[PDB]
Amino acid sequence: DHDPCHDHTGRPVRCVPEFINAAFGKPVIASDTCGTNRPDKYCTVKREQCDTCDARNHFQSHPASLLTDLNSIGNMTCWVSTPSLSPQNVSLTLSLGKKFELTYVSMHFCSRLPDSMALYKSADFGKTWTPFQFYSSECRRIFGRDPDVSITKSNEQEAVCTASHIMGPGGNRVAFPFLENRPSAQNFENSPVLQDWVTATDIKVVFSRLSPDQAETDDEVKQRYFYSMGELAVGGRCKCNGHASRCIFDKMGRYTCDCKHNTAGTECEMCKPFHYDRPWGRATANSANSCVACNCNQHAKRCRFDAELFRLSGNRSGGVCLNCRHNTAGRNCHLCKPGFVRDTSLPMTHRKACKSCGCHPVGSLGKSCNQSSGQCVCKPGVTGTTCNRCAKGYQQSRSTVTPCIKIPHHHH
Ligand SMILES: *[C@@H]1O[C@H](CO[C@@H]2O[C@@H](C)[C@@H](O)[C@@H](O)[C@@H]2O)[C@@H](O[C@@H]2O[C@H](CO)[C@@H](O[C@@H]3O[C@H](CO[C@H]4O[C@H](CO)[C@@H](O)[C@H](O)[C@@H]4O)[C@@H](O)[C@H](O)[C@@H]3O)[C@H](O)[C@H]2NC(C)=O)[C@H](O[C@@H]2O[C@@H](C)[C@@H](O)[C@@H](O)[C@@H]2O)[C@H]1NC(C)=O
Numbered sequence: 001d002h003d004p005c006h007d008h009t010g011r012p013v014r015c016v017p018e019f020i021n022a023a024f025g026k027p028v029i030a031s032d033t034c035g036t037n038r039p040d041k042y043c044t045v046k047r048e049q050c051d052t053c054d055a056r057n058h059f060q061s062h063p064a065s066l067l068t069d070l071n072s073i074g075n076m077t078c079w080v081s082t083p084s085l086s087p088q089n090v091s092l093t094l095s096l097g098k099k100f101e102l103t104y105v106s107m108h109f110c111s112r113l114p115d116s117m118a119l120y121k122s123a124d125f126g127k128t129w130t131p132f133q134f135y136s137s138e139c140r141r142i143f144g145r146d147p148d149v150s151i152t153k154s155n156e157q158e159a160v161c162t163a164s165h166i167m168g169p170g171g172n173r174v175a176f177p178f179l180e181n182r183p184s185a186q187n188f189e190n191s192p193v194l195q196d197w198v199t200a201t202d203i204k205v206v207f208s209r210l211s212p213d214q215a216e217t218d219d220e221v222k223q224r225y226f227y228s229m230g231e232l233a234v235g236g237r238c239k240c241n242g243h244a245s246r247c248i249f250d251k252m253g254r255y256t257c258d259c260k261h262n263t264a265g266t267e268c269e270m271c272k273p274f275h276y277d278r279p280w281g282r283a284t285a286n287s288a289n290s291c292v293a294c295n296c297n298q299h300a301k302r303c304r305f306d307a308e309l310f311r312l313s314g315n316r317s318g319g320v321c322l323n324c325r326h327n328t329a330g331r332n333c334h335l336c337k338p339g340f341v342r343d344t345s346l347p348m349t350h351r352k353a354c355k356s357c358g359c360h361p362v363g364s365l366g367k368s369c370n371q372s373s374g375q376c377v378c379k380p381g382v383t384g385t386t387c388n389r390c391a392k393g394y395q396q397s398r399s400t401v402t403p404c405i406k407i408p409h410h411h412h
């Protein structure tokens with residue numbers, strides 16, 4: 001149908017997947033959920049209102065799945081942690097299944113806004129995590145960071161910690177935009193540091209403290225300390241480096257880019273086989289940086305990119321063909337192997353572009369012949385196109401070093 005990766009004439013152009021809420025309809029894995037072991041009373045103030053949380057009944061259950069489901073206008077389904085007068089180390093983990101480039105992470109809390117939480121991302125499918133924003137009324141003591149550290153050109157990946165969520169304008173909704181206040185934001189397409197900043201395969205929210213212990217048996221106030229949230233939204237695009245308009249499931253089940261521009265890899269981050277004439281690049285407004293096919297004059301199955309050759313060509317071509325067949329030779333299989341010669345009547349792409357020199361081994365000095373006329377390298381006294389007969393005045397000797405000696409009594 002419509003390929004947004006080529007313009008109406010067919011020229012390659014930059015293309016990106018559509019911007020989505022990439023959290024939506026994906027599992028969130030909570031470290032703790034109320035009503036898991038036994039019913040649990042929890043209470044929220046508005047007058048105080050208590051409910052029972054029991055995971056065995058749908059009307060009483062608050063699983064993490066509620067975080068990325070469809071919400072009704074006055075009916076927000078909320079996940080709820082287990083009431084404890086000592087709540088901490090409670091985490092939510094979301095797998096995107098694929099690298100995305102993220103614009104924002106939004107959290108819509110239900111009861112109270114948590115005092116201290118940390119946002120992390122992974123870019124290796126959960127193997128490792130780095131922070132990217134903190135929230136706390138005591139950044140220094142809790143998270144070992146100064147509050148509201150200024151972002152300069154020399155710390156654009158700063159993971160800021162702030163207490164400004166507390167009476168913030170979003171109320172119970174907290175949104176972190178990845179590019180806000182980043183100096184290189186307007187130069188994103190030429191900012192590897194920012195391109196790294198916004199790349200993630202997973203997100204993780206870690207809650208450390210509900211309140212600074214500033215907010216009747218203890219079973220009663222226990223029913224007020226709990227984490228609770230109804231909407232986890234992660235806005236971004238599937239990362240394809242400008243070389244795909246959509247991501248798909250291939251026939252092996254992998255979620256991956258629908259790579260265009262003769263690229264390959266799950267992120268279109270390398271060139272396809274036999275497309276190694278130019279270095280890979282990310283597409284930009286100026287140019288798609290489409291990978292370029294090697295030229296092996298129909299004589300080679302594989303090729304490789306040689307960077308120094310590319311730099312010597314004037315940054316034009318850099319593919320080196322591998323194992324040229326059919327007695328061809330050269331980095332483009334554009335020449336003839338030693339002992340062969342360019343059959344001019346056929347094209348270089350023909351399976352018989354290079355015909356044997358046919359040089360008679362005894363009368364010639366080398367197997368290789370004149371690449372233009374085919375004439376072989378004749379020893380003294382030898383003549384012929386392939387140096388296979390003695391010249392006038394010479395006669396076949398016995399030695400194979402000098403097979404033609406002068407004829408005695410023959411005038412020269
Ligand atoms: C918020 O939304 C939920 C989910 O309902 C869906 O979403 C809303 C937005 C709307 O689009 C609905 O049409 C959707 O279905 C509401 O919960 C649902 O409420 C209705 C009416 O009370 C209830 O229907 C009865 O179901 C009985 C059987 O119940 C059991 O079986 C179901 C199927 O296995 C389970 O899903 C259910 O949990 C029970 O275990 C049946 O005998 C009756 O004849 C009705 O048909 C739905 O089952 C119920 N879905 C649930 C609980 O998952 C919320 O409604 C609120 O909660 C329930 C418990 C009542 O107290 C409601 O009166 C109350 O309003 C809704 N909250 C709002 C609107 O404030």
Ligand SMILES: *[C@@H]1O[C@H](CO)[C@@H](O)[C@H](O)[C@H]1NC(C)=O
Pocket residue numbers: 089
């Ligand atoms: C929090 O829980 C994890 C998972 O068991 C554990 O590895 C970690 O040590 C706990 N505490 C802290 C302070 O990280």
Ligand SMILES: [Ca+2]
Pocket residue numbers: 066067068069070071076077078230231
């Ligand atoms: Ca919800």
